[PDB]
Scaffold this active site. Structure first.
Site, short mmCIF file in Angstrom:
data_model
loop_
_atom_site.label_atom_id
_atom_site.label_comp_id
_atom_site.label_asym_id
_atom_site.label_seq_id
_atom_site.Cartn_x
_atom_site.Cartn_y
_atom_site.Cartn_z
N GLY A 100 2.64 6.51 9.60
CA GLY A 100 4.06 6.42 9.21
C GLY A 100 4.72 5.14 9.70
O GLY A 100 5.82 4.87 9.19
N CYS B 268 3.75 1.90 9.31
CA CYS B 268 3.63 0.82 8.28
C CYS B 268 5.05 0.38 7.85
O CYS B 268 5.90 1.26 7.65
CB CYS B 268 2.80 1.27 7.08
SG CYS B 268 1.35 2.31 7.40
N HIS C 179 0.84 -1.22 0.00
CA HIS C 179 0.00 0.00 0.00
C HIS C 179 0.87 1.26 0.00
O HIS C 179 0.30 2.37 -0.01
CB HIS C 179 -1.04 -0.04 1.11
CG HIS C 179 -0.50 0.17 2.48
ND1 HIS C 179 -0.75 -0.72 3.51
CD2 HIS C 179 0.26 1.15 3.00
CE1 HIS C 179 -0.20 -0.27 4.62
NE2 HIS C 179 0.44 0.85 4.33
#
Ligand SMILES: *C(=C)CNC(=O)[C@H](CC(N)=O)NC(C)=O
Ligand SMILES: *C(=C)CNC(=O)[C@H](CC(N)=O)NC(C)=O
EC number: 3.4.19.12
Lengths: 304, 304
Positions: free
Chosen positions: A143, A145, A41
């Site tokens: 942030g 991820c 993603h």
């Protein structure tokens, strides 16, 4: 003496964290050899996340669209592919700090360390468990991820988790390092509800053993039970069923303490039925379930 | 979202740990520049610890009697001195992994990360607080002496603790990196009893703020209080008195949440008087006091 929620030393993983940017999305990547692993993603806008077609979004992306920064030096991306829910970015430079590593898919109830990272930079390390509903209860801001979960065996990092998602209930979902989500979760901003967060019984018993070893003994009772009788009580309290496999795994802690596993089950049964009555065990007012039997042995033996 | 007991990433400190052996005693040392810092009781037998005269014991020791091993390579000791309760071993090689560092003496209620080490090798990292009685509740087995506590500000490690001692009650005592014990403790195997382990009130309030920020709000009540009224209740529950300095430090969390500090004090007062009634806050059944206001801001803002 003393028993603490303890993470693995993080240095070996700190040496692997990078920043990945695609257009206006920035998150973390894991640089091992000449591959950077990150959540797919990274290619999405927040708008895309409502209903992403990842294969279609990826067609619009070239190697030069993936900006990979390791410290304040840019890595050259020479290839990219999607594996399940992760991107693999091939870079022209092998990470010189690549530790010995493996990719493992852990089972529910297994514990691991998380190195929380933002912009490719470590902020903190903490100990997690894969919940029986395949969520983790982490600390993950925007942030975060691409932050990873890991275990260390002497010199070998076993990576078991990469962070992808916060559910609307504020619990966390992610993948192994092959990109396969734990549980039924998908990398889409949609209604995803977790199942029952049951208590990891074998881990509670391990921690009761840790308590006895560290001199917290008040809860030890005069009773024993059977697996079947214990399991009836466990079901009533949303505890995972205890199997003979769990009893076998607790054998060494049984041996060390001289408390039969089924005797400790009967102590646990009374704690479930009676409560703590305002007492604590190892500084906790609830029964801790994020220590595995292996964790308790390791911490009580001082493995490095 | 989510709030975890989080340690600093440990890599910068892992790069400083060495083994120190003197005769048959082995413990950990901290190698910064060309100095290795370790507990002076490295020169003691267990027999010596009952009544050590450190200056007299040290007369019998030369540079070559201190064996310093960094990984599996020996460092050459070219000088040694005692500063308070630490030895400084001058070595001929500057630690090439020396981070930017400072030595700080922390106040009670201040939190720090511990890198638990055995034989100069890291086993785990966890978050501690300096208790109001100047003990810490750590996880320290035999061989853990010389393990250090630290905070990190971006790239600078502030070392605040070196482990020396387990009290007969199984709580821990140690020094700053100038060798001065926290509290009244001495490096002797004798009767040393801790004072009252009071609750770090300003840290509980910080953690209640963290709870509100992460959506745990059930305990927020309709009441306010004064510092004087709150403090009467705090004294009764062995909580530290709250000062206007503490109120000032909680200002930014007050601002972020829109809950006046004295309103949160009144919520805390009701939790003390009423108990949790079997409810949890951020997965805890007791009021957590090992997060500073700075910790809560850091973790809620994602500082790296
Ligand atoms: C997971 C970390 C997705 N990343 C984000 O949503 C933010 C926003 C952005 N500009 O990418 N990333 C950071 C670094 O905050
Ligand atoms: C504090 C760590 C003091 N060290 C010890 O008591 C043990 C025993 C020894 N042989 O020095 N050290 C280790 C490495 O276990």
């Amino acid at each position: 003496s003393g028993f603490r929620k303890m993470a693995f030393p993080s240095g070996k993983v700190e040496g692997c964290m990078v920043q990945v940017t695609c257009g206006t999305t920035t998150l973390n990547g894991l640089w091992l050899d000449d591959v950077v692993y990150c959540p797919r993603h990274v290619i999405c806008t927040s708008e895309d996340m409502l209903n992403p077609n990842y294969e279609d979004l990826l067609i619009r992306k070239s190697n030069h669209n993936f900006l990979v920064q390791a410290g304040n030096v840019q890595l050259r991306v020479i290839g990219h592919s999607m594996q399940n829910c992760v991107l693999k970015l091939k870079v022209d430079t092998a990470n010189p700090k690549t530790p010995k590593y493996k990719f493992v898919r852990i089972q529910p109830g297994q514990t691991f360390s998380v190195l929380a990272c933002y912009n490719g930079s470590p902020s903190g390390v903490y100990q997690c468990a894969m919940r029986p509903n395949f969520t983790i209860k982490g600390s993950f801001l925007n942030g975060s991820c691409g932050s990873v979960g890991f275990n260390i065996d002497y010199d070998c990092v076993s990576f078991c988790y990469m962070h992808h998602m916060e559910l609307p209930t504020g619990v966390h979902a992610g993948t192994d390092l092959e990109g396969n989500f734990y549980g039924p979760f998908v990398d889409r901003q949609t209604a995803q509800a977790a199942g029952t967060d049951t208590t990891i019984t074998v881990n509670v018993l391990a921690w009761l053993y840790a308590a006895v070893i560290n001199g917290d003994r008040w809860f030890l009772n005069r009773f024993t039970t059977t697996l079947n009788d214990f399991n009836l009580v466990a079901m009533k309290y949303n505890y995972e069923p205890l199997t003979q496999d769990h009893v076998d795994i607790l054998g060494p802690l049984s041996a060390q303490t001289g408390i039969a596993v089924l005797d400790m089950c009967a102590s646990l049964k009374e704690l479930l039925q009676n409560g703590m009555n305002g007492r604590t065990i190892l500084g906790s007012a609830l029964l801790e379930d994020e220590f595995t039997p292996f964790d308790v042995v390791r911490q009580c033996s001082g493995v490095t």
